[PDB]
């Protein structure tokens, strides 16, 4: 079985959430490959199939559980299991399609959505942009129930789409960015729910090119400034890796060092 990390929304604290996200990072990568002080995810090339995924088992107040599968090469959620049924996003390529057959192999009902697990498609399905989808412990609790009830026809597609958008941000994005982990910690500490601001959205949208820009630069300066946004939406440019080191927890493998 692939490694399993557990988290519950029942009595979640900033400490329990932090421990969770730290454990997710530690399973995503060994931390052996580090560029400009930022750990890199394992290279798809050379990654055996028995080390390809990690499982995040989520529980809530209702004691309902679902298990998300995460690809260690990019921290993307590729599918989930609830009871005796597993659902996978439409794979991006043939190799990924084959890889996911190694997931949840004892489940008797496997399904593949016609849509991939990217924000653009999910937002369309949900009928809402990330900017308008609240995040926090409450939202996660509700997302877990929605995922759990999908197999029994108790969950509408738009709600499923929304729920995925919530889980992805609070798990994957938080894993990728210390800044986003911090934002979720704050929501939790104060028992608040709220949509992510532009600073969060812009980071999520830039993870790929940030990874590239960092691994590309020899001494740590950027040939072309990276544009990001503050909470208030105002744009600001980033000329070197210093500011990014405390913001990014890990990068996707782009090139060799």
């Amino acid at each position: 079985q692939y490694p399993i990390i557990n988290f519950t929304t029942a009595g979640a604290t900033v400490q329990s959430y932090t421990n969770f996200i730290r454990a997710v990072r530690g399973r995503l990568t060994t931390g052996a490959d580090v560029r400009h002080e930022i750990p890199v995810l394992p290279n798809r090339v050379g990654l055996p199939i028995n080390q390809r995924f990690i499982l995040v088992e989520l529980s809530n107040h209702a004691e309902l559980s679902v298990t998300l599968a995460l690809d260690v090469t990019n921290a993307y959620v590729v599918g989930y299991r609830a009871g005796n049924s597993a659902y996978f996003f439409h794979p991006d390529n043939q190799e990924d399609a084959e890889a996911i057959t190694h997931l949840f192999t004892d489940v008797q009902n496997r399904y593949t959505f016609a849509f991939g697990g990217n924000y653009d498609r999910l937002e369309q399905l949900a009928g809402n942009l990330r900017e308008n989808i609240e995040l926090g412990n409450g939202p996660l609790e509700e997302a877990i129930s929605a995922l759990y009830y999908y197999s029994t026809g108790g969950t509408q597609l738009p709600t499923l789409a929304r729920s995925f958008i919530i889980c992805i941000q609070m798990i994957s994005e938080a894993a990728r960015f210390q800044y986003i982990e911090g934002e979720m910690r704050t929501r939790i500490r104060y028992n608040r729910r709220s949509a992510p601001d532009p600073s969060v959205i812009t980071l999520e949208n830039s993870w790929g090119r940030l990874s590239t820009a960092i691994q590309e630069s020899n001494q740590g300066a950027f040939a072309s400034p990276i544009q990001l946004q503050r909470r208030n939406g105002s744009k600001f440019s980033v000329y070197d890796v210093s500011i990014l080191i405390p913001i990014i927890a890990l990068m996707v493998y782009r090139c060799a060092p």
Partner: nanobody
Framework: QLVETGVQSGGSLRLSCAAS????????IGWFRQAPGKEYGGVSC???????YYADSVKGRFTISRDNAKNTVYLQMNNLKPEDTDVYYC????????????????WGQGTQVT
């Protein structure tokens, strides 16, 4: 930024993907469908070399090309069928395989083809 621009059963179309701010020369570029169904990966891709990839279903019909000058990438779509109806979009990644894998460095909004 990547911006895309560009029919009766059997007709053709020419999709274009223009990059603003940077040059597509050093990027792996791929065209993709919003709903591939039973197939996976790009519709057609070009290496950052300059090999090209084509999905079996479009071989002999589609041709992808680069115009370094104007700094855009073209997708020629001949002998179109009803089943080709979909949203097509442009995605670029600087390193890795000829067909960009998520996460992309850059991608476009995509256009509809019926």
């Amino acid at each position: 930024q990547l911006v895309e621009t560009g029919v009766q059963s059997g007709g053709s179309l020419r999709l274009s993907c223009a990059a603003s701010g940077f040059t597509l020369d050093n990027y792996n570029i791929g065209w993709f469908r919003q709903a591939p169904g039973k197939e996976y990966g790009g519709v057609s891709c070009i290496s950052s070399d300059g090999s090209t990839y084509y999905a079996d279903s479009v071989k002999g019909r589609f041709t992808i090309s680069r115009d370094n000058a104007k700094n855009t990438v073209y997708l020629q779509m001949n002998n179109l069928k009803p089943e080709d109806t979909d949203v097509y979009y442009c995605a670029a990644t600087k390193y890795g395989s000829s067909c960009p894998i998520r996460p992309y460095d850059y991608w476009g909004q995509g256009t509809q083809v019926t």
